[PDB]
Design a protein around this ligand. Sequence first.
Ligand code: NAG
Ligand code: FE
Ligand code: FE
Length: 677
Amino acid sequence: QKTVRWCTISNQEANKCSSFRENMSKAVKNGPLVSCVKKSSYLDCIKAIRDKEADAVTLDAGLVFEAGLAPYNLKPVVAEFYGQKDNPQTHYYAVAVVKKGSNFQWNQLQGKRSCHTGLGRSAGWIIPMGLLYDQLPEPRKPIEKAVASFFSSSCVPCADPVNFPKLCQQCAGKGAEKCACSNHEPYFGYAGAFNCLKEDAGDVAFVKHSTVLENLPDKADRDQYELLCRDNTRRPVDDYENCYLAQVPSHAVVARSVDGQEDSIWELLNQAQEHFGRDKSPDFQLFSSSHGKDLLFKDSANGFLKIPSKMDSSLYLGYQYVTALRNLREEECKKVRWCAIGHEETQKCDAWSINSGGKIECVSAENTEDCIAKIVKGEADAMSLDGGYIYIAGKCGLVPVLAENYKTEGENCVNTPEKGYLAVAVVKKSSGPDLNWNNLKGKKSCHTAVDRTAGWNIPMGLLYNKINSCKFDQFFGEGCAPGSQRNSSLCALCIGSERAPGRECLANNHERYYGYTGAFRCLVEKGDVAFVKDQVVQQNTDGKNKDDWAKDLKQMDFELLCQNGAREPVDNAENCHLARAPNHAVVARDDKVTCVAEELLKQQAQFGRHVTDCSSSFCMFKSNTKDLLFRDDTQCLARVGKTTYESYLGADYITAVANLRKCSTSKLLEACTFHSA
Ligand SMILES: *[C@@H]1O[C@H](CO)[C@@H](O)[C@H](O)[C@H]1NC(C)=O
Ligand SMILES: [Fe+3]
Ligand SMILES: [Fe+3]
């Protein structure tokens, strides 16, 4: 019924696509149909997809980046994987292949002849040229001109043969097909570049790690070839793991960002790998063809993986690679951009910005995950996170910069490491003794949010060990666990916002039961147990909180549930808690750690706890509502040195969280753990 229109770039690809079509028709009765649209290069395909004349094409990651730019706006939806299906690799190695006895090293490439897969491609172009950049003769813009003056001549398929003739000089295509961006140029692609070297049109080929073994005959003339290593030595072709230029992400199928039919694309490809995958059929091979190498998909792929929905091109490629790509394409610690979540945090941020004289700038997002993603992508620089989210951010590659401290007051606060706060379970003293730790089934729970330390990871981790199931919403009766599935019973007690409707169960300040205070309010108004930090009761009772719901509460009206079944007063969490919680911390990308840390230590020297008059001046650690930007009981931000999320959080906490990985519903976590190695 549904049709996926695949874009081909050559007569050879068109031949394979016709057989893909015919074979899928026969093998799959109801699965999407395939039809083929024949263009003459990947760039014509990207445009055909944008204009809705086609739906899909497979691209080297370097070109995924170009497809993801305006005005094309395509996104990667399915990735090739290499290697064994039980340990799929979503990267491959770029290498430089030379013939034995040619006697030159990496540092002597000047004046040689080069064979490239194609302009703008990972192994063929982006990686080798990024490495050689500093040796190219200036001016290096555009890069083509500099490359044409560095190598004596080359074959770079897809280069403009009119403006850069030397880049197309060693290519082998006839007439108008010379230097073509397709299999009509014999030296196009991995196979082509290798043939370029083989036939002595070039002295070096920039290809991938499987290229030589894939393209050499029945037996091994393989001893005739070697690899150029970056330490200026040469190694055998099967020793690429010790002689590669870089590791690069998989070729991926791309599609329209809006109305891209990706559902259809995955359904097609998934069924196709089942019937016509590696060694699956004599009638048709997805990853092979008698008409050529790497047609439609690479011959070294062994299947497909669906790309998570939150992985856009930036996330798929990774920030380092996007920066190298950006570097070759366009031809400081002045400020810290904070990521604020929602309106109240944005207003506190704005105030900070003004008071700081612009050293702090403010970027907004509607939830924690969107903030973390902005930081990873370079749209923001820092925010403070609960341990549960540090874990997620750490998987996405962010690093802890400074810790919030809660126990140490005064001048030594910044230099004192704290062990952590405590995750506890708080109940009303008035609840009968049947309410205890071993009898929570069917009870009404209040949680700070899904994926936070005290609110979720610690308690739900403990419970998972008992019930051996991720269906928490079938264990508890009804609760408020912000961030849960909207029609779950774990959203049923949530009350959203007083001003705007439809905000129930959101994991942000629109939800009145969100956060430490929030969950304590949930306990007071509706729940039986709150999963929260120690001290939340003391901080919101006996008059410290003046809001209607809290003004008459007393500390003595609450108790803690201990794991042995007993109950203790709230002043005794040290002997009645669920586990230690790592202190919340400011995270940043590895390139900004120093900058973020140094400026914040200066911010707090001006705006920290010692400010006796908050109003005339700004107070970083006090908040109009609750835990705006930092926890309200934060005494200072403290140095953590050079550490990683794993050592910051501790093996005990890492163990607990990883224990729950099967139950995770975080879309960010799913995107940040997609890639191998
Ligand atoms: C609840 O919502 C989801 C969509 O987000 C839907 O898939 C599910 O089947 C709905 N019904 C149930 C079983 O609660
Ligand atoms: Fe590639
Ligand atoms: Fe916390």
